[PDB]
């Protein structure tokens, strides 16, 4: 099974990249259910994570760096929901764009990555229930998994990546 992200404009085949981690935001306020939605503040959050490749993207780190043995989540303050959660992967997930306006990600590989990221967020926050919800909303560069590629700029809808619960 596969997950197809709608991207406009259509990225060419040679923008087929590796996802090496992402950036989350814990939704504040208030059941023992913690809710994370992919961060989309300003380019400086994505910068500060420093698991950043030359490819200047949002939501997901494309062609960034990988951790060693396993997933490592990081934050400047676990209590400040304003402060993002830099998730860094160990083993990358391939995003492949057919150039028909569609980019594809293995459902297996991604679900696996969520399981792990959930586990670590659980260690940190001590809860039981980890909910991934889509982008909270904002300017188009963030509310969508955006990126540059060959000088051209693309956007992708990613609400299909972040919509699950874990226990």
């Amino acid at each position: 099974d596969t997950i197809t992200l709608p991207c406009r404009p259509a990225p060419p085949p040679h923008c087929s990249s590796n996802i090496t981690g992402l950036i989350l935001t814990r939704q504040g306020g208030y059941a023992n259910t913690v809710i994370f939605r992919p961060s989309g503040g300003d380019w400086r959050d994505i910068a500060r994570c420093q698991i950043a490749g030359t490819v200047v993207s949002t939501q997901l780190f494309l062609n960034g760096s990988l951790a060693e043995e396993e997933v490592v989540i990081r934050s400047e303050d676990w209590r400040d929901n304003a402060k993002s959660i830099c998730v860094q992967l160990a083993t990358s997930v391939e995003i492949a764009c057919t150039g028909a306006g569609h980019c594809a990600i293995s459902r297996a590989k991604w679900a696996n990555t969520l399981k792990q990221i959930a586990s670590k967020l659980r260690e940190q926050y001590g809860a039981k229930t980890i909910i991934f919800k889509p982008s909270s909303g904002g300017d188009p560069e963030f509310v969508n998994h955006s990126f540059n590629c060959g000088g051209e700029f693309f956007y992708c809808a990613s609400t299909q990546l972040f919509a699950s619960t874990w226990f």
Epitope: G41, D42, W43, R44, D45, A47, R48, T54, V56, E76, D77, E141, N148, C149, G151, E152, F153
Partner: antibody, heavy 119, light 108 residues
Framework: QVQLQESGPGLVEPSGTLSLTCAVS?????????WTWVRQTPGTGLEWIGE???????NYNPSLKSRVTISVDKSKNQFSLKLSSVIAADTAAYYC????????????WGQGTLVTVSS | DIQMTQSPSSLSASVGDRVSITCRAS??????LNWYQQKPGKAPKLLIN???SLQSGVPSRVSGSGSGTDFTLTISSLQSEDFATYYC?????????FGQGTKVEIKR
Amino acid sequence: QVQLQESGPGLVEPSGTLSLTCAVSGGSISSTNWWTWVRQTPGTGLEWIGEIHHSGITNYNPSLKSRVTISVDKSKNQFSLKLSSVIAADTAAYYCARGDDILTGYNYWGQGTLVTVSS
Amino acid sequence: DIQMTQSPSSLSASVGDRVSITCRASQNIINYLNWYQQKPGKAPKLLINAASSLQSGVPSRVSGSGSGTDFTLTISSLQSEDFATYYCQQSHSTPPTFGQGTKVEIKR
């Protein structure tokens, strides 16, 4: 080393638009850096306007979004600032400066150019 | 925006003296703070980045410290040619905010 010189008119009567060009010498605008415009007014201080990546990405100060445009001319090896609907409030000195991988520091600056909004 | 309040705004020291300028940020900005020197009618000169990394080309007299909500610029042996205004600058989050400035006047 890298060097920046601004160019463009130091007078713009109200309503109209301020066009201004940073010419980059001894370094490409197609590097790994961002390129920034900052204005400075006596009494008011330093205000960051916006920045642009070599890949057409554009960050603008919230306060000026409705009015501001930054562009990259890769053929001429320059970048440019265009402010529409200018008011007397915009009477200031306009610098083009190159940071260093949006890592904090605005490393090299241009000599800046003064711009009056007067009729 | 992140509010950068310098301290003081205007000071008066001697040739050889030790100058200290503070910069308080509204939010925790980690260590993403930069110090600029600007002499009259000239473009700002990057003294310090990351609140401590002496930009190459500046004297070692100049030094930087702090991390969080408070930072310090120190000039450990002031000279005739340090007559300038000094600015602390945000870098953690757009917009990069600046400080109002500190006016170091040489006393003689």
